[PDB]
Design a binder for this molecule. Structure first.
Ligand SMILES: *[C@@H]1O[C@H](CO)[C@@H](O[C@@H]2O[C@H](CO)[C@@H](O[C@@H]3O[C@H](CO)[C@@H](O)[C@H](O)[C@@H]3O)[C@H](O)[C@H]2NC(C)=O)[C@H](O)[C@H]1NC(C)=O
Ligand SMILES: *[C@@H]1O[C@H](CO)[C@@H](O[C@@H]2O[C@H](CO)[C@@H](O[C@@H]3O[C@H](CO)[C@@H](O)[C@H](O)[C@@H]3O)[C@H](O)[C@H]2NC(C)=O)[C@H](O)[C@H]1NC(C)=O
Ligand SMILES: *[C@@H]1O[C@H](CO)[C@@H](O[C@@H]2O[C@H](CO)[C@@H](O[C@@H]3O[C@H](CO)[C@@H](O)[C@H](O)[C@@H]3O)[C@H](O)[C@H]2NC(C)=O)[C@H](O)[C@H]1NC(C)=O
Ligand SMILES: *[C@@H]1O[C@H](CO)[C@@H](O[C@@H]2O[C@H](CO)[C@@H](O[C@@H]3O[C@H](CO)[C@@H](O)[C@H](O)[C@@H]3O)[C@H](O)[C@H]2NC(C)=O)[C@H](O)[C@H]1NC(C)=O
Ligand SMILES: *[C@@H]1O[C@H](CO)[C@@H](O[C@@H]2O[C@H](CO)[C@@H](O[C@@H]3O[C@H](CO)[C@@H](O)[C@H](O)[C@@H]3O)[C@H](O)[C@H]2NC(C)=O)[C@H](O)[C@H]1NC(C)=O
Ligand SMILES: NC1=N[C@H]2O[C@@H]3[C@]4(O)O[C@@H]5[C@H]2[C@@]3(N1)[C@@H](O)[C@H](O4)[C@]5(O)CO
Ligand SMILES: *[C@@H]1O[C@H](CO)[C@@H](O)[C@H](O)[C@H]1NC(C)=O
Ligand SMILES: *[C@@H]1O[C@H](CO)[C@@H](O)[C@H](O)[C@H]1NC(C)=O
Lengths: 120, 1174, 173
C-alpha cells in the first residue's frame, strides 16, 4: 500500500477533543493540484463505509450527518499530514477511520486504517 | 599454545579457562565459525528475509554470542594486558554483537541504518580467515604512501575547478527558451492571466528538448556555440542538466565535474554540453584538463602506488633470506591379462610421442577454426557441415583419451594435471551428444573451447597467460578473496541502504515508473553496480541514486566504492604483474645534389612546404561551395605542390642513387605519396578526371602529412621506438586474439541471432513480447502494415566472430558495452522478440569476459610491454627512447640544474629602516601570513556561485578589492626594499605579473565603459586572479619535486604529442572526406560531427581517450533501409545520407588501436620517469 | 544541409543558368512547411514583380512573357520543407538581368508551438554573351606558372653555383 503511519489505538474522553492523524512519507514531495486524499469512516468493522472528506484539487468535505460540523481538516499535506480532528466525540463514532491517499507522480496508491473508541 | 603470562581473575589454572582455551584454538571452532559466517553472508544476500528464517538469524546471533562468551572467559576484560580489547578486530566483534542486542528490541527509527550495520558480520571474514589481516595492512601502507599525490590532486582539482567555475558559471543552464513572449496568453500559475518572469523562465514546456532526447537542449549566444531554432533565444532558464548535478555554477558541483573529468567517467557528455553552451573554442580548457588532470594525475597516483607496492614486495621477499594404495594397485592398474599387457605396450608405442603432439595440436587448431565459423543465418548444408565436423573432432579426442588410457595405467594417467583437464573436457564433450534434446542450456557446448588451451604446452606466452590466471587464484588467492569480500560488502551495503529507496522513488529516475536498468534493489543488480563502479562508470548511477535516496549517502558510498575497490583492483593487478615479472661529371653532379640536400635551410624550406601542402587539405569540407576563391587558389597551388615534390624526388634520386634511395622505408613512403599524387594529377589533366577508382584515390591524399614523419625528428624517433617494439607485441597480440576468439565463439554460441527488434518507430517502442513473440508474426504485422514497423538488429551484435570481435572490443574498452549487455540480457531465443531482463544471468558472461579477456589480457600485455621497454632501455645504456639528441642535452641540463643551489641570501642593506623592513620581509612569519591570505582569497573565490544575491556580489567585490590592494602593497613594499635584487627569482616575477594583471582586471572592470566591451576577455582576466593561489606550491617540497618531474619529462610528451596530433590530422581528413554528410543520429549531432576540420578534430580528440567512440561509430553502420540513399543535401552536389560501414569500422578500430598504443607510451614515458626520480 | 552559397552573378546568352538561393534552418531536425516567392526587376526599371511562387507541391509562375516556357525549378523535390530554393533558367536572354530576390517563408513546427518566419536574400545577376571567366582562377594560373618557373630557376642557379664552387675546389687537389 502506502507508507502511512497512524496511532494504532486512541482513547478519548466523553465529549473531549480527539485528533486522529494519517501521517505518510513518500517520494515526490506533495503538490496541491494533482494530489488527492480521501477519508472514509465506518461506524463498525462489518457495516457500511461512508465517504465524508475529499481533497480533489481543493478541500471537499461531504459533511455527513455523523460529522456535520465536528470533523475538521487542519492538517498539512505539504508537511505530510492529512489529519482529521473530531470535536465532541460521541460513542456511536466508535468504529474505523480509513484515509485513502494517492501521491500524484508515484503510483504507490495505498490505504489507511484507524480504530477509534470512546470511553464511558 | 597456552603461553599465558596473563595472571588475571579467574586464574589460568582453572578447568573452565583451560577448556575454553583448548576449544578456542581448536581448528574445528574456526571451521564452524567459517560455516556460520558464510551462511550469514548468504542470508544477507537474501533481499527480503522470510520470517521462517528470522529464527535462523537468531541462531546465527547465538553462535556469535557463544564466541563472544568464550573470548571473554579467555582474557576478556580490557584491564589485563594482551586482552581482546588490545586486538582491534575484537572491537568490531563487540560492536556488532552489541548492536544486534540493540536491534532485536526497541531502537531508533532509522531502520535502514541499523539493518545496514549488520555488514560488520560479513566484515568478520577479514579478521578470521588466515592471512587477510596482512593484506589489509599492505593496502594501508600503500595508501599511507600516496599522501602527497592526494594533496597535489586535491589542490590541482581545486585550481582547475575555480577555472571552470569562473568560465562556465551558469552556462550549463543555457536553454532554448521561447523568446517572442506571447503576452496575451501568458497565464499565471494560479490562473491570474498575468505574466511573471520567474514563472515563464522556469516553466518546463518553454524549452526545446530535441525530439527523442530527455534533457532540454543547451544553447548559446556565441558565434560557435549551439544554435537555437527559429523562435527561441539563449537565456539561462531552469534547472541544470542531469537532474541538476552537472553544473559549474558552484564550487561543489565544479569540483564534482572536474573529478568526473579526472577519471574520464562519461566526460564526453560534459564535453559536449559545455562546448555546446559556451562555444567550441573552449575545447582548449578540456585539452588542458585531460592532459594534466586526467592523464598526468592518474599516472602519478598509479606510479606512486606501484613504487610503494614494489618497495613492500621486495622488502618482504628480502626479509625471508596405504589403505587406499592397495585398492589402487588392483583397480587403477589394468594389467590382468597377458594379451591385454601386450596391447598396452603396442598402443603405447603407437602413440608416437614425436608425432602425436603435432597431430593432436593440428586437430585442436582445426577444431577451433571450425567452431569459429558460426552464424545466425546458416544454410542447412553449412550447419550440417558444422555438426559433422563437431562429431569428427570429438571422436578424435575420445580416441586419443581412450588410447592414452589403455597405453598408460589410469593411476599414472590421472596423476598428470593436464590429463585430468583432458578428461574433464572429454567427459563434457560426451555428455553433449547423449543430451541432444535438453531444453535451453546452450552454455554447455561452449566448454569445448578449452581444448585450445592444450596449446599451452606449445606456446611459452600462452603458458604465461595460464601462469597469470593461476597466480590469481594461487599465490594471490587470498588477495583476490579480499577483493571478492569487498565487492560483496559494498554490494550488500548498497542493497540495504538504497534498495528500498530505488523502489519507492521509481518515477523520479525512470519516466515509465519502472526500475532503471542498473539499480540497487536486488543483490545481483547491486553487485552489477559495484562492478560497474570498478570498471569505471560510477557517475551515471550515482546520479540516479542521489535522485532517489539523498545526495550525501550516495556521495559517501560511491566515493568509498571507487577509492577502496580501485585500490584493491590496482593492488591485485600489480600483484599479478610482479608475480609474472620474476668525362667525370656524374660524380660531381651526385655530390652537388648531396650537398644541396644536406643543407639545413633547404630542409626547413621543405618542412614549410609539406606543412602548407598538408594544411591545404583542411579547407576541403562541406563549406567548400562557399569561398570558391579559396578552393580555386588551393587547387591551383596543388599543382605547384605536386611539381615541387616530384622535383624533390628526382633531386634526391640524383643525390643518393637508386639503390641507396630504395633501401630506405621513408623514401619508399615519400615515393609512394608523390607517385599517387602524380597519378591523380595526370588523371585529372586527361579527360579521365572521374568515373572510376580515381575519385576513391582522391581521398588517399589524406596521407600527405606522413612526410612530416620522415622530416620531423621527434615523430621519427617515436615511430622508430614503436616499430622496434612491435615484434615483442606480435605474439602477445596473437594470444589476445586467440583468447578473445574463445570468448567471441562462446558469445556467438550464447547470443547469435538473439539481437533483433521490432520497432514501431512512429512510437519507437520495442514491442513487448506478447503482441509479437516470433519473427514470423512480426513479418505478419509487416505484410498487413507498411514499413513503419521493422525488424532491426543491434548494430554491434554477436552474429559471427567478426561482429563478435567488434562488440567485444566495445565491451573491453568500457565504451558502448551498455547497449550490448542490455540486448544480451533481454535475449531469449534466436527468432524471438527480446523481453526486458528475461536472461539477467547473461550479465555474468560479460563479467567473466571483463575479468579474463580485458583484465588478465591487459595485465599480460602491460607486463610484456614493460619487459620490452626495460630491455630497450638497457640496450642503449639506460637512455630514453623518446628524445632527440638535443632533447637529451635538454634533459641532462635539467638533471644538473635540479640540485640544491647555494643561493645568495641577499645581505642586509646599510640602513636601520631598511634593516627592519628586511627583517619584516625575510621573517618566516611574513611568508606564512601571505600563504594564509592566499588561502582566504582562494576560499572567497570558491564561494562565488551562480544566482547569488546582489549583496553577496558586492561583498565579494569589495573583499577582492581589499585582497588585491594587500597583495599590491606587499609587492611595492618589496620593490622599495630591493627592486633590482627582487627581480632575480622567478617566483617574484610570477608575483609581479599576477598582481599587475589583477590590477588590469580590476581597472578594466571599472572602465568597461569604453568602445571595447568584451565579457569573455574579462572572465579570462578574472581567471588571471587564480595564478596567485599557485604560489602555495612554493611552500611545498614533494609537490615541487613532482612538478619538477613533469617539467623534466615534458620533451618525450611533446614528441608523442606531435605524433598523436599528426595521426589526429590524418584521421580527421579521412573523416572530412568520408564521414561528412552522415546522418546525425547518436553522438553525431548538428555539432561534434565530421563536417569541418574543427568539428572533426573535436571528435578525434574525444575518441583519443576512447570516450564514446561507439557513439561516433553507430551512425556510420546504418544502411539505406535505415537511411536515405538519395538525399537532397542543399548547397552541395554530394548525395547520400550515410557512409560505408566497412570503412567506418576500419576507421575507428584502427584509431582505437593506434591511439591506444600512443597514449600507452605517454603513460610509460611518465611512469618510468617518475621511478627514475628516486 | 547548411551550405549557404550565393548564386553566380554572370549568365551567358542562349544557354542555361542556375539561380541559387539556399536558406538554411538553424537546427535541421525541425520540420517546417515552407513556400517561396521570387521578386524580379530589370536593370534600370521600376520596383520588383513576383515571377514564380513554389508552395510545397507545384511551381506556379506569373504570366509574364519574360519567363514563360523557359523557367524550371531546381530546389528540393517534393519534401514540403524546401531548404533549397533554386530557379533554373533555360535559354537565357538579355532581359533576364537586374535584381533577383528570393523570398522564403517558413512555418516551423514544434512541440506545441507554431512559428512563421521570413528570410529575404538578394542576388544581382548580369547577362553577357562571352563567358567572362573569373579573375581569381586566371591570377592563380599566372601564380602557378611564375612559382614553377622561379623555383626551377632557383634550383638551376643553386646547382650551377655549387658545381662551379666544387669544381674549383677539386681542381686544387
Ligand atoms: C507553461 O506554459 C504552458 C503554455 O501556456 C501552460 O499550459 C497552459 O496552461 C493553462 C492553464 O494551466 C491552460 O489554460 C486552460 O485551458 C483550459 C482549456 O483546456 C481552460 O478551461 C482553463 O480555464 C485554462 O484557461 C492552457 O490551455 C495551457 N496551454 C497549453 C498549450 O497546454 C502551462 O500551464 C505552463 N506551466 C505552468 C507550470 O504554469
Ligand atoms: C495569483 O497571485 C497573484 C500574486 O500572488 C495575485 O495578484 C494579486 O492580485 C490582486 C487582485 O487584483 C492585487 O490586489 C490589488 O492590486 C491592485 C493593483 O493595482 C492594487 O491597486 C490594489 O490595492 C490591490 O492590492 C494584488 O496586488 C496582486 N499581487 C499580489 C502580490 O497580491 C493574483 O490575484 C492571484 N490570482 C488569483 C486568481 O488569486
Ligand atoms: C543571450 O542573449 C540575450 C540578448 O542578446 C541575453 O539577454 C536576454 O535579453 C532579453 C531581452 O533581449 C531579456 O528579456 C528581458 O529580461 C528581463 C530581465 O529582468 C525580464 O525581466 C523581462 O521580462 C524580459 O524577458 C532576457 O532576460 C535576457 N536574458 C537573461 C538571462 O536575463 C541572454 O542572457 C543571453 N544568454 C546567455 C548569455 O546565456
Ligand atoms: C505504432 O504506434 C503508433 C503510435 O502513435 C500508432 O499510431 C496510432 O494509431 C492509431 C490507430 O487507431 C491512431 O488513432 C487514430 O487517430 C486518429 C486521429 O485522432 C483518429 O481519427 C482515428 O479514428 C484513430 O483513433 C493514432 O492517431 C496513431 N498515432 C500516430 C501518432 O500516428 C500505430 O498504429 C502503431 N503501429 C502498430 C503496427 O502498432
Ligand atoms: C510462434 O510460432 C508458434 C508456431 O510456430 C506458435 O504456436 C502456435 O500458437 C498459436 C497461438 O499462440 C496456437 O493457436 C492456438 O492454440 C491454442 C492451444 O495451443 C488453441 O486453443 C487456440 O484455439 C489456437 O488454435 C497454435 O496451436 C500454436 N501451435 C501449435 C503447434 O500448437 C506461437 O504461438 C507463436 N508465438 C506467438 C504467436 O507469440
Ligand atoms: N562513461 C560512459 N561511456 C560510454 O560508455 C557507456 C556506453 O556504453 O556508451 C556511452 C557511454 C556510457 N558511459 C553510457 O552512458 C552509454 O553506454 C553511452 O553513453 C551512450 O552512447
Ligand atoms: C494582444 O491583443 C490585443 C488585442 O486586444 C492587441 O492589440 C495587442 O497588440 C496584442 N499584444 C500582443 C503582445 O500579442
Ligand atoms: C506567414 O507569413 C507570411 C508573411 O507575410 C504570410 O504571407 C502568411 O500568410 C503567413 N502564414 C501563416 C500560416 O501564418
Amino acid at each position: 500500500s502506502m507508507e502511512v503511519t497512524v496511532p494504532a489505538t486512541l482513547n478519548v474522553l466523553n465529549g473531549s477533543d480527539a485528533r486522529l492523524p494519517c501521517t505518510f512519507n513518500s517520494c515526490y514531495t506533495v503538490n496541491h493540484k494533482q494530489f488527492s486524499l480521501n477519508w472514509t469512516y465506518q461506524e463498525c468493522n462489518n457495516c457500511s463505509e461512508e465517504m465524508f472528506l475529499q481533497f480533489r484539487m481543493k478541500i471537499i468535505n461531504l459533511k455527513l450527518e455523523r460529522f456535520q460540523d465536528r470533523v475538521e481538516f487542519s492538517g498539512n499535506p505539504s508537511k505530510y499530514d492529512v489529519s482529521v480532528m473530531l470535536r465532541n466525540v460521541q460513542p456511536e463514532d466508535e468504529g474505523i477511520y480509513n484515509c485513502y491517499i494517492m501521491n500524484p507522480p508515484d503510483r504507490h496508491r495505498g490505504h489507511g486504517k484507524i480504530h477509534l473508541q470512546v470511553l464511558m | 599454545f597456552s603461553a599465558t603470562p596473563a595472571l588475571y581473575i579467574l586464574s589460568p589454572f582453572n578447568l573452565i579457562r583451560r577448556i575454553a582455551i583448548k576449544i578456542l584454538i581448536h581448528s574445528v571452532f574456526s571451521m564452524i565459525i567459517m560455516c556460520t559466517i558464510l551462511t550469514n553472508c548468504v542470508f544477507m544476500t537474501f533481499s527480503n528475509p522470510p520470517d521462517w528464517s528470522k529464527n535462523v538469524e537468531y541462531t546465527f546471533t547465538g553462535i556469535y554470542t557463544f564466541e563472544s562468551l568464550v573470548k571473554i572467559i579467555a582474557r576478556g576484560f580490557c584491564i589485563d594486558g594482551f586482552t581482546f580489547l588490545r586486538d582491534p578486530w575484537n572491537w568490531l566483534d563487540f560492536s556488532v554483537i552489541m548492536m544486534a542486542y540493540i536491534t532485536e528490541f526497541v531502537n531508533l527509527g532509522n531502520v535502514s541504518a541499523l539493518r545496514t550495520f549488520r555488514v560488520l558480520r560479513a566484515l568478520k571474514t577479514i579478521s578470521v580467515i588466515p592471512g587477510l589481516k596482512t593484506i589489509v595492512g599492505a593496502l594501508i601502507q600503500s595508501v599511507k604512501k600516496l599522501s602527497d599525490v592526494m594533496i597535489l590532486t586535491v589542490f590541482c582539482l581545486s585550481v582547475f575547478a575555480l577555472i571552470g567555475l569562473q568560465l562556465f558559471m551558469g552556462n550549463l543552464r543555457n536553454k532554448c527558451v521561447v523568446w517572442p513572449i506571447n503576452f496575451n496568453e501568458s497565464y499565471l500559475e494560479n490562473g491570474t492571466k498575468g505574466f511573471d518572469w520567474e514563472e515563464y523562465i522556469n516553466n518546463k514546456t518553454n524549452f526545446y528538448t530535441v525530439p527523442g532526447m530527455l534533457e532540454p537542449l543547451l544553447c548559446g549566444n556565441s558565434s560557435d556555440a549551439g544554435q537555437c531554432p527559429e523562435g527561441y533565444q539563449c537565456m539561462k532558464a531552469g534547472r541544470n542538466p542531469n537532474y541538476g548535478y552537472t553544473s559549474f555554477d558552484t564550487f561543489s558541483w565544479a569540483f564534482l565535474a572536474l573529478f568526473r573529468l579526472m577519471t574520464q567517467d562519461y566526460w564526453e557528455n560534459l564535453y559536449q554540453l559545455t562546448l555546446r553552451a559556451a562555444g567550441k573554442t573552449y575545447m582548449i580548457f578540456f585539452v588542458l584538463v585531460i592532459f594534466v588532470g586526467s592523464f598526468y594525475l592518474v599516472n602519478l597516483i598509479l606510479a606512486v602506488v606501484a613504487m610503494a607496492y614494489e618497495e613492500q614486495n621486495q622488502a618482504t621477499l628480502e626479509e625471508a633470506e596405504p589403505c587406499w594404495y592397495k585398492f589402487a594397485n588392483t583397480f587403477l592398474i589394468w594389467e590382468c591379462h597377458p594379451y591385454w599387457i601386450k596391447l598396452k605396450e603396442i598402443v603405447n608405442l603407437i602413440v608416437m610421442d614425436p608425432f602425436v603432439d603435432l597431430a593432436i595440436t593440428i586437430c585442436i587448431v582445426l577444431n577451433t577454426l571450425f567452431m569459429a565459423m558460426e552464424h545466425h543465418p546458416m544454410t542447412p548444408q553449412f550447419e550440417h557441415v558444422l555438426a559433422v565436423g563437431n562429431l569428427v573432432f570429438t571422436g578424435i579426442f575420445t580416441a586419443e583419451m581412450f588410447l592414452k588410457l589403455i597405453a598408460m595405467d589410469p593411476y599414472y594417467y590421472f596423476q598428470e594435471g593436464w590429463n585430468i583437464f583432458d578428461g574433464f573436457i572429454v567427459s563434457l564433450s560426451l555428455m553433449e551428444l547423449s543430451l541432444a534434446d535438453v531444453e535451453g542450456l546452450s552454455v554447455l557446448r561452449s566448454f569445448r573451447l578449452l581444448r585450445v588451451f592444450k596449446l599451452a604446452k606449445s606456446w611459452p606466452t600462452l603458458n604465461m597467460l595460464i601462469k597469470i590466471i593461476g597466480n590469481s587464484v594461487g599465490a594471490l588467492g587470498n588477495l583476490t578473496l579480499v577483493l571478492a569480500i569487498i565487492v560483496f560488502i559494498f554490494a550488500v551495503v548498497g542493497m540495504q541502504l538504497f534498495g528500498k529507496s530505488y523502489k519507492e522513488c521509481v518515477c523520479k529516475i525512470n519516466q515509465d515508473c519502472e526500475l532503471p536498468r542498473w539499480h540497487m534493489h536486488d543483490f545481483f543488480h547491486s553487485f552489477l553496480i559495484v562492478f560497474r563502479v570498478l570498471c569505471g562508470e560510477w557517475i551515471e548511477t550515482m546520479w540516479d541514486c542521489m535522485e532517489v535516496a539523498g545526495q550525501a549517502m550516495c556521495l559517501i558510498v560511491f566515493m568509498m566504492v571507487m577509492v577502496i575497490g580501485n585500490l584493491v583492483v590496482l593492488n591485485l593487478f600489480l600483484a599479478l604483474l610482479l608475480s609474472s615479472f620474476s668525362g667525370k661529371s656524374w660524380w660531381i653532379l651526385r655530390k652537388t645534389c648531396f650537398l644541396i640536400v644536406e643543407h639545413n635551410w633547404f630542409e626547413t624550406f621543405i618542412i614549410f612546404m609539406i606543412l602548407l601542402s598538408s594544411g591545404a587539405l583542411a579547407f576541403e569540407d562541406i563549406y567548400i561551395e562557399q569561398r570558391k576563391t579559396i578552393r580555386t587558389i588551393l587547387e591551383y597551388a596543388d599543382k605547384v605542390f605536386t611539381y615541387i615534390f616530384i622535383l624533390e624526388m628526382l633531386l634526391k634520386w640524383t643525390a643518393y642513387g637508386f639503390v641507396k634511395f630504395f633501401t630506405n622505408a621513408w623514401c619508399w613512403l615519400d615515393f609512394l605519396i608523390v607517385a599517387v599524387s602524380l597519378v591523380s594529377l595526370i588523371a585529372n589533366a586527361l579527360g579521365y578526371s572521374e568515373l572510376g577508382a580515381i575519385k576513391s584515390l582522391r581521398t588517399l591524399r589524406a596521407l600527405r602529412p606522413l612526410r612530416a614523419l620522415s622530416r620531423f625528428e621527434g615523430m621519427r624517433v617515436v615511430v622508430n621506438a614503436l616499430v622496434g617494439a612491435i615484434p615483442s607485441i606480435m605474439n602477445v597480440l596473437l594470444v589476445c586474439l586467440i583468447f578473445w576468439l574463445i570468448f567471441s565463439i562462446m558469445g556467438v554460441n550464447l547470443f547469435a541471432g538473439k539481437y533483433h527488434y521490432c520497432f514501431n518507430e512512429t512510437s519507437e517502442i520495442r514491442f513487448e513480447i506478447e503482441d509479437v513473440n516470433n519473427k514470423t508474426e512480426c513479418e505478419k504485422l509487416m505484410e498487413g502494415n507498411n514499413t513503419e514497423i521493422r525488424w532491426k538488429n543491434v548494430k554491434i551484435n554477436f552474429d559471427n566472430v567478426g561482429a563478435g570481435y567488434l562488440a567485444l572490443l566495445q565491451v573491453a574498452t568500457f565504451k558502448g558495452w551498455m547497449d550490448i549487455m542490455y540486448a544480451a540480457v533481454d535475449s531469449r531465443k534466436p527468432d524471438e522478440q527480446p523481453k526486458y531482463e528475461d536472461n539477467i544471468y547473461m550479465y555474468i558472461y560479460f563479467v567473466i569476459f571483463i575479468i579474463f579477456g580485458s583484465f588478465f589480457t591487459l595485465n599480460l600485455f602491460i607486463g610484456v610491454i614493460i619487459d620490452n621497454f626495460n630491455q630497450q632501455k638497457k640496450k642503449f645504456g639506460g637512455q630514453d627512447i623518446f628524445m632527440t639528441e638535443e632533447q637529451k642535452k635538454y634533459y641532462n641540463a635539467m638533471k644538473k640544474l635540479g640540485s640544491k643551489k647555494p643561493q645568495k641570501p641577499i645581505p642586509r642593506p646599510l640602513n636601520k629602516i631598511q634593516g627592519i623592513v628586511f627583517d619584516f620581509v625575510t621573517q618566516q612569519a611574513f611568508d606564512i601570513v601571505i600563504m594564509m591570505l592566499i588561502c582566504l582569497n582562494m576560499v572567497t573565490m570558491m564561494v562565488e556561485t551562480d544566482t547569488q544575491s546582489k549583496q553577496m556580489e558586492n561583498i565579494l567585490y569589495w573583499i577582492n578589492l581589499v585582497f588585491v590592494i594587500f597583495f599590491t602593497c606587499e609587492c611595492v613594499l618589496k620593490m622599495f626594499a630591493l627592486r633590482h635584487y627582487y627581480f632575480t627569482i622567478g617566483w617574484n616575477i610570477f608575483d609581479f605579473v599576477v598582481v599587475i594583471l589583477s590590477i588590469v582586471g580590476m581597472f578594466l572592470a571599472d572602465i568597461i565603459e569604453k568602445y571595447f566591451v568584451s565579457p569573455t576577455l574579462f572572465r579570462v582576466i578574472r581567471l588571471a586572479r587564480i595564478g596567485r593561489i599557485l604560489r602555495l606550491i612554493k611552500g611545498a617540497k614533494g609537490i615541487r619535486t613532482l612538478l619538477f618531474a613533469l617539467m623534466m619529462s615534458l620533451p618525450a610528451l611533446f614528441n608523442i604529442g606531435l605524433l598523436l596530433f599528426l595521426v589526429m590530422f590524418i584521421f580527421s581528413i579521412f573523416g572530412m572526406s568520408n564521414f561528412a554528410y552522415v546522418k546525425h543520429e547518436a553522438g553525431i549531432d548538428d555539432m561534434f560531427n565530421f563536417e569541418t576540420f574543427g568539428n572533426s578534430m573535436i571528435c578525434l580528440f574525444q575518441i583519443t581517450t576512447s570516450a564514446g567512440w561507439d557513439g561516433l561509430l553507430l551512425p556510420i553502420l546504418n544502411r539505406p533501409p535505415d537511411c536515405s540513399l538519395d538525399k537532397e543535401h542543399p548547397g552541395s552536389g554530394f548525395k547520400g545520407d550515410c557512409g560505408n560501414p566497412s570503412v567506418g569500422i576500419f576507421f575507428f578500430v584502427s584509431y582505437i588501436i593506434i591511439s591506444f598504443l600512443i597514449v600507452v607510451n605517454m603513460y610509460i614515458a611518465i611512469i618510468l620517469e617518475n621511478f627514475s626520480v628516486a | 544541409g547548411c551550405v549557404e552559397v550565393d548564386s553566380e552573378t554572370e549568365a551567358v546568352y542562349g544557354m542555361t543558368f542556375k539561380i541559387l538561393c539556399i536558406s538554411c534552418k538553424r537546427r535541421s531536425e525541425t520540420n517546417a512547411e515552407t513556400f517561396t516567392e521570387w521578386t524580379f526587376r530589370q536593370k534600370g526599371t521600376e520596383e520588383f514583380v513576383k515571377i514564380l511562387r513554389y508552395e510545397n507541391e507545384v511551381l506556379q509562375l506569373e504570366e509574364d512573357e519574360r519567363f514563360e516556357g523557359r523557367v524550371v525549378w531546381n530546389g528540393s523535390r517534393g519534401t514540403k520543407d524546401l531548404q533549397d530554393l533554386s530557379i533554373f533558367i533555360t535559354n537565357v536572354t538579355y532581359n533576364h538581368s537586374g535584381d533577383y530576390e528570393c523570398h522564403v517563408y517558413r512555418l516551423l513546427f514544434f512541440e506545441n508551438y507554431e512559428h512563421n518566419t521570413s528570410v529575404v536574400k538578394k542576388i544581382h545577376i548580369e547577362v553577357v554573351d562571352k563567358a567572362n571567366r573569373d579573375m581569381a582562377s586566371i591570377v592563380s594560373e599566372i601564380m602557378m606558372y611564375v612559382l614553377i618557373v622561379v623555383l626551377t630557376i632557383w634550383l638551376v642557379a643553386e646547382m650551377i653555383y655549387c658545381y662551379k664552387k666544387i669544381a674549383a675546389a677539386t681542381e686544387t687537389a
